[PDB]
Structure 1
Amino acid sequence: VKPNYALKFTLAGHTKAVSSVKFSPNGEWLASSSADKLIKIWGAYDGKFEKTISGHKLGISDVAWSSDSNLLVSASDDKTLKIWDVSSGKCLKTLKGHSNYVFCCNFNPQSNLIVSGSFDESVRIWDVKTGKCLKTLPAHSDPVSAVHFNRDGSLIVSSSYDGLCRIWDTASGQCLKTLIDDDNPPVSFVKFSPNGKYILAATLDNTLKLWDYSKGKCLKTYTGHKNEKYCIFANFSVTGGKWIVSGSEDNLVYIWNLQTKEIVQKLQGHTDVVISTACHPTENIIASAALENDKTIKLWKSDC
């Protein structure tokens, strides 16, 4: 079985490169962050622009939804994160304390906590209600490229240019595991599988790997794409067939079979590096976004 993703919409309106796109957990919305210091909200199913959210003093590298789809968090080069009410567009909180560009962010499932990773080689855990920083993990010896909570929020996975993935106990901040592999290539992205048993990690040697968290063993490898310079988002697609979805520096969206590792589709149409992909929580829908020479988001639909 192979998917047949086809272009449904292109979304234009960011004035610089787009950095991240995410579907709202309720499937209604796509949120995009960009170098032009803006977040934009679009309808997931019709591509209609809904609103712009602004207030960061520099560009935004990541954005994430709360579980109830009511809040957003953004990570910015102005060294802060911001918590936003989506319906009103107002900034509810500004999370300060990182000493460098903030690069990645995510809510936990309960959405009382936010995790962030920064160029200051640190991971921080923040309280949503008060905006205070609860914990600072001396997580890495290089910039932190990704942070992600597991299914129930008891664990944090982080990745860094230092070549390490680290599993942390959220409650204690103690490191439970470190994944190392061979020649220590920079790790550009990491995230838990939906079941929380596996970890998908991108390295800047044109490689994706599926690791079993419990065993510390790499189970699958995915290649054929170009990934050497940027921290590209990758995804588990679970609404139809079980795919791995990633962007690529050859302007293509790559889709692999999870079990067999064969490339099952390449989505063509972007005119720059595809920095971010996102998979719709209930429909076979992919959102992709590209850098300076493109500046657009594309929505793709498939039957499986």
Structure 2
Amino acid sequence: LKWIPRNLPSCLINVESSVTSVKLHPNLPIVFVATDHGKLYAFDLFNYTIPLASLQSHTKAITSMDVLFTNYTNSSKKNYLVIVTASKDLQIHVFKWVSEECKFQQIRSLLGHEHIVSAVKIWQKNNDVHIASCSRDQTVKIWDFHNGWSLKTFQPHSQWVRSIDVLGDYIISGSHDTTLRLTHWPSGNGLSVGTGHEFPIEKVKFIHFIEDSPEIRFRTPSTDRYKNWGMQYCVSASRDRTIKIWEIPLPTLMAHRAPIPNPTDSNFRCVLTLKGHLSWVRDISIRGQYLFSCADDKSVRCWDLNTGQCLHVWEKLHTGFVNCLDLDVDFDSNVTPRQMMVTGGLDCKSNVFM
């Protein structure tokens, strides 16, 4: 389908200060507004101003948030009941969502990163047992979600790590060194290195249930079926003022494990480069046929992933940096609820589109 989360803020949200990330609860039409207060707010998309939850606890600010979407029923059972966030206070804050439509209690507070934790991604692949995290320490860590343990640490980056994802048995991360690096969650064996940017990595993201992106760019580019079934896509928006559609199947961290190891461990693949505009991209939504991004320039953009053509620019949705978007995942039965985008930014506002 063509997802059209447009119209014009069905709900205008005036926030105490700025917003860093707004994402939808796995099952309910409520979102969690991650602010710089650091307060996490529970928010029914069809109501305002909601005092349901003003979860002050992120001592400094909310830098990361995950588990608001789920891909596996037995873990889902707890995922709709939990969330993993992280702050500038070096803690990875794991909470328990309850039937009250909010994170009633805290489950875990993880510490080991010393310079600011920049991003956390949960190993849903491990039934919500392992947690991937990264930070300004140039370091990537694995934690035990259900026990609060530091399970495994890796050193990939040369610079302060900016973003993170989970894919295969390896941990995806991007940083200020402009290079993406991916190491094996159990050993350090790599699954990607990307020297595909001039400037630092700002946003990474694995393809989901949307073969439309493969229809547009079948990958791998060399023998797609080599790993078409294993399409471990990723993307990497960066300070190049681009949104590059990436791939870890053939810029794999095989450190020349033959001579030129296929074409892995080099100048990163770059499936499709969406040349951006005059500012830095803050968020994206890989729709499949389309991509919905936003940037410091106050704009939200509809991109046609068929060559990466910005179909429409909405520079007036915010009056400050657009910090975040959340066009809810493809999912029939809730097409209108999924064709709904929430956003937040520098201007202390947040908006609900559809």
TM-score by length of 1: 0.75
- 2:122, 2:90 → 1: CA distance? 18
- 1:85, 1:73 → 2: CA distance? 9
More strand by share: 1
In structure 2, the partner of 1:59 is 116
In structure 2, the partner of 1:4 is 46
- 1:189, 1:227 → 2: CA distance? 14
Q: 1:220 to 1:243 in 2, by over 3 A?
A: farther
From 276, 287, 293, the equivalent of 1:201 is: 293
- 2:119, 2:185 → 1: CA distance? 17
In structure 2, the partner of 1:41 is 94
* Aligned amino acid, residue 95 of structure 2: W
From 164, 181, 204, the equivalent of 1:124 is: 181
Q: Tell me, what secondary structure is at the counterpart of 1:192?
A: coil
Shift of 1:217: 1.8
From 317, 323, 331, the equivalent of 1:224 is: 317
Higher gyration radius (CA): 2
Q: 1:245 to 1:192 in 2, by over 3 A?
A: same
Shift of 1:90: 0.9
Q: 1:211 to 1:54 in 2, by over 3 A?
A: same
In structure 1, the partner of 2:325 is 234
Q: Percent identity between the aligned chains?
A: 25
TM-score by length of 2: 0.65
* Aligned amino acid, residue 149 of structure 2: K
Which ranges of structure 1 fall in alignment gaps of 5 or more residues? 258-304
- 2:141, 2:46 → 1: CA distance? 37
* Aligned amino acid, residue 206 of structure 1: K
From 82, 97, 101, the equivalent of 1:29 is: 82
- 2:183, 2:87 → 1: CA distance? 23
Report how many aligned residue pairs link the two structures.
Answer: 250
TM-superposition CA deviations, 1:208-230 (whole Å, max 9, x none): 212122332223433321343xx
More helix by share: 2
* Aligned residues: CA RMSD: 2.2
Shift of 1:114: 2.4
- 1:65, 1:205 → 2: CA distance? 30
Q: Tell me, what secondary structure is at the counterpart of 1:167?
A: strand
- 1:103, 1:233 → 2: CA distance? 15
Shift of 1:191: 4.0
* Aligned amino acid, residue 175 of structure 2: S
Q: Describe how 1:140-151 pairs up with structure 2 within 5 A.
A: 140-151=197-208
Q: Tell me, what secondary structure is at the counterpart of 1:149?
A: coil
Q: Tell me, what secondary structure is at the counterpart of 1:175?
A: coil
Q: Does 1:137 align with 2:194?
A: yes
Q: 1:232 to 1:94 in 2, by over 3 A?
A: farther
- 1:20, 1:73 → 2: CA distance? 12
- 1:233, 1:57 → 2: CA distance? 26
- 1:250, 1:148 → 2: CA distance? 26
Q: 1:252 to 1:184 in 2, by over 3 A?
A: closer
In structure 2, the partner of 1:188 is 282
Which ranges of structure 2 fall in alignment gaps of 5 or more residues? 1-6, 11-44, 71-75, 210-230, 252-268
Q: Does 1:84 align with 2:137?
A: no
- 2:302, 2:188 → 1: CA distance? 34
CA contact under 8 A between 2:191 and 2:248: conserved in structure 1?
no
